[PDB]
Amino acid sequence: GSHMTYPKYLLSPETIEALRKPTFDVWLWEPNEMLSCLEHMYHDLGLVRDFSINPVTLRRWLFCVHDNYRNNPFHNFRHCFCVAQMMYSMVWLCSLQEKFSQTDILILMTAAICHDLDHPGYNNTYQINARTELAVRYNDISPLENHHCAVAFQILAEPECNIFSNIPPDGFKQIRQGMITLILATDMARHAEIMDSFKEKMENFDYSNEEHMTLLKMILIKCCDISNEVRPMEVAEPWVDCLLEEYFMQSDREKSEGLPVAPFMDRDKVTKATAQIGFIKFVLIPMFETVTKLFPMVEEIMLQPLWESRDRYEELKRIDDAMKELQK
C-alpha cells in the first residue's frame, strides 16, 4: 500500500507489524525475505544498539547461518526462522524486556536462530544406534545439540560473521555459556527433567534468582522450538508432514540397517493425527500451562490454539480410523 513497489527483501510496514505476532505466516517468504525479518528483529529489540553489532556483520552472520542449515524436510532454515520468530513474538507478548536484561534477550534470540545448525535429518537415537561419527565424537551425550552449538561458535569465530566482536570478553563468556545451556536444553530426551526442575522453582519463582532465570530461559527456547501447533492451523499443518517425512526416512533406514525403530516413527503405526494428539495433550499443553502461571496472557494467545488443534486432530483421527475400517 505504498506509492511504488519495493523489492521483497525490503519488508513492508504491514509485514513488520505482523512479525510481532504468533499468527505470522512463515510459509509466505523466501530465504532472503526471512533473512531480512531476522535482521529487523535484532535492530528492533535494540540488540544492534546495545551490543554495538556492526549492521553488515549482522547480515553476513545471518547469511552464513542460513548456509549452514541443511535442506531437510523439517530441520531446515525455515524452522530456525519459526523458532526465532516465535521467540520474538514471546518477547512482545510476555513483556520480556521488563523481566530480562538485554544480554538475556540476545542469548534467547541467538540460541533460537542457531539451535538446529547443520542438522543431518536423523535424530540422536539414530546417531547413537548407528554409532555415527557424531555419536562417537560426543560420547552419546546429546550429540546433535552439541554439534549445533559447536557450529554456532565456529560461524561466530569467523571475523566477518562475529556479531559479538564489540562485546567485552566477560560479556562474550556470559553469552556463550547462556547459548550453550539453551541449545543443549532443546534435546527432548531431557524434557521431563527440565520440566520437573522448572516446576520446582515455580513453587516460589524468583526473577532475581539466576538459577530460576536460567530454567525459565530453557523453558522459553523449548516452547519456541516445539511451538508449530500454536500457529494458525493453515500455518501449523504443513509442518507435520515435514516432520513425518524425516521420521519415516529415519525408521526406513533403521529397518534396513537392522537398528531399533521407535514406534512413533513407524510408517505402519503413525498418523498425522496420532502423532499430534499425544504431543499436544502431554507435551505442549502442560508446558504452556506452567508458563501461563508467570505470563497469564499466554493462555489466550497460545493455549487456545493448542486446545483447538487438539480438538481438530481428534476429529481427523475418527475419520482416519474409519478410513482404515475400509482399507483392509
Ligand X SMILES: Nc1nc2c(ncn2[C@@H]2O[C@H](COP(=O)(O)O)[C@@H](O)[C@H]2O)c(=O)[nH]1
Residue 313's identity, in one-letter code, is: Y
Cell of 246: 524425516
Q: Are 310 and 285 in contact (CB under 8 A)?
A: yes
Does 43 appear as a known binding residue? Answer: no
Which stretch, 49-57, 92-100, 158-166, 225-233, contacts Mn ion (CB under 5 A)? Answer: 225-233
Q: Are 25 and 235 in contact (CB under 8 A)?
A: yes
Residues 104-133 close enough to bind Mn ion by CB under 5 A: 116
Nearer to Mn ion, 145 or 162 (CB): 145
Residues 165-194 close enough to bind Mg ion by CB under 5 A: 186
Candidate list 75, 119, 147, 148, residue with the active-site label = 75
Residue 186 contacts ligand X per CB under 6 A: yes
Residue 287 contacts ligand X per CB under 6 A: no
Nearer to ligand X, 80 or 167 (CB): 80
Q: How far is the CB of 224 from Mn ion (least distance, A)?
A: 9
Nearer to ligand X, 251 or 276 (CB): 276
Residues 188-227 close enough to bind ligand X by CB under 6 A: 188, 225-226
Residue 116 contacts Mg ion per CB under 5 A: yes
Q: Are 69 and 23 in contact (CB under 8 A)?
A: no
Does 119 appear as a known binding residue? Answer: no
59-88 mask for ligand X (x: CB under 6 A)? ----------------x-------------
Q: Are 87 and 64 in contact (CB under 8 A)?
A: no
Helices 285-294 and 191-202 pack at an angle, to 10 degrees, of: 30
Residues in Cβ contact with 114 at an 8 Å cutoff, skipping those fewer than 6 apart: 65, 80, 148, 149, 151, 152, 155, 179, 183
Nearer to Mg ion, 224 or 261 (CB): 224
HEC readout, 160-227: HHCCCCCCCHHHHHHHHHHHHHHHHCCCHHHHHHHHHHHHHHHCCCCCCCHHHHHHHHHHHHHHHHCC
Q: Minimal CB distance to Mn ion: which residue? A: 116
Given 229, 287, 298, 301, the residue binding ligand X (CB under 6 A): 229
Q: State in Å, rounded, how far the first CA of the chain is from the last one.
A: 55
Residue 90 binding partner per list Mg ion, ligand X, Mn ion, none, with a CB distance cut-off of 5 to 8 Å that depends on partner kind? none
Which stretch, 40-48, 221-229, 241-249, 287-295, contacts Mn ion (CB under 5 A)? Answer: 221-229
Which stretch, 31-39, 92-100, 212-220, 222-230, contacts Mn ion (CB under 5 A)? Answer: 222-230
CA distance 150 to 141: 14
198 φ/ψ angles, rounded to the nearest 5 degrees? -65, -50
CA distance 176 to 111: 10
Catalytic, 3? Answer no
Residue 173's identity, in one-letter code, is: K
Catalytic center residues: 75
Q: Point out the annotated binding site for Mg(2+).
A: 116
Residues forming the site for Mn ion (CB under 5 A) = 116, 225
Q: Point out the annotated binding site for 3',5'-cyclic GMP.
A: 75-79, 116, 225, 247, 275-276
